[PDB]
Amino acid sequence: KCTPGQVKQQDCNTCTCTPTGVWGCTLMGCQP
Amino acid sequence: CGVPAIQPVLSIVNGEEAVPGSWPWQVSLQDKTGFHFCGGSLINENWVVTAAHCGVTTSDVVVAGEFDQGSSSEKIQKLKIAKVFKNSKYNSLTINNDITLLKLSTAASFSQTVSAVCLPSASDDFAAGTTCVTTGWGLTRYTNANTPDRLQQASLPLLSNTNCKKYWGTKIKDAMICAGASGVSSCMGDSGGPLVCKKNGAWTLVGIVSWGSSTCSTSTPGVYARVTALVNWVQQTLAAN
After folding, report:
1. Do B151 and B201 fall into the same domain?
2. Distance, in angstroms, between A28 CA and closest chain B CA?
3. What is the CATH number of the domain that holds B57?
4. Chain A residues 1-30 with CB within 8 Å of chain B
5. Active-site annotation of B, residues
6. Is residue B125 part of a domain?
7. What is the largest CA-CA distance in chain A?
8. C-alpha pair distances (Å), B108 with each of B32, B101, B116, B160, B235
9. What values do phi and psi take at B115, rounded to 5?
10. Residues B38 and B94 reside in one and the same domain
11. How close does chain A come to B200, measured CA to CA in Å?
């Protein structure tokens, strides 16, 4: 959940708050 | 292609252990130290298709014929990447055209546990509601921070891009297809993995695990790169290289 527009970052994944205000991130595997 | 020697039995958050070698085209992309960071699919003896956001380098390795990543008794095939072909229209902003081809420096050896998945026609159409399967060594709980040892599988329906937009709005482009929101969900570690549907008797790669809910919500559709909308590119790359 978020503000439509902002781009955050998971451990090693990119997230882009979709027009519907939700965190849609990539599903890659992060070692850290 | 798309005909496993070991027929898969079907009854990733909420997945289930696959029959060993029942998804022969499923490879694992690992870094120098053996860490699994993405899935991939063998489309022929020299190429593997995966998601563009996995950022694979020739310094990474493709592992085929693997079921239990913790086992050392399996007869796997660690192959080297000769060259990476990232789709030029990929955008890390919209996560669209999320696809990358990997030309191997040494062809794989097809056998009972290693073979290729079929590619669809740019015109091929897969109806919404169609049950398909996705596989992978992705988290089995967003609350696990540890991937499963054994390959998982899950059945899930395809959604029409129209219904899918009710969930993600305009982030859903034409080169994207959604599946899920049915009790299962791909998760960290599943990226690049396949989404295959059985058509006319053979398994066809219709989607590539791309992105979805940040908490692998089993009630939110997952987004996959739509292969039918990217095959021409895939074909041309193979033909020219």
Report:
1. yes
2. 5
3. 2.40.10.10
4. 4, 7, 10, 13-16, 18-20, 22-30
5. 53, 98, 191
6. yes
7. 30
8. 19, 15, 10, 36, 19
9. -155, 180
10. yes
11. 30
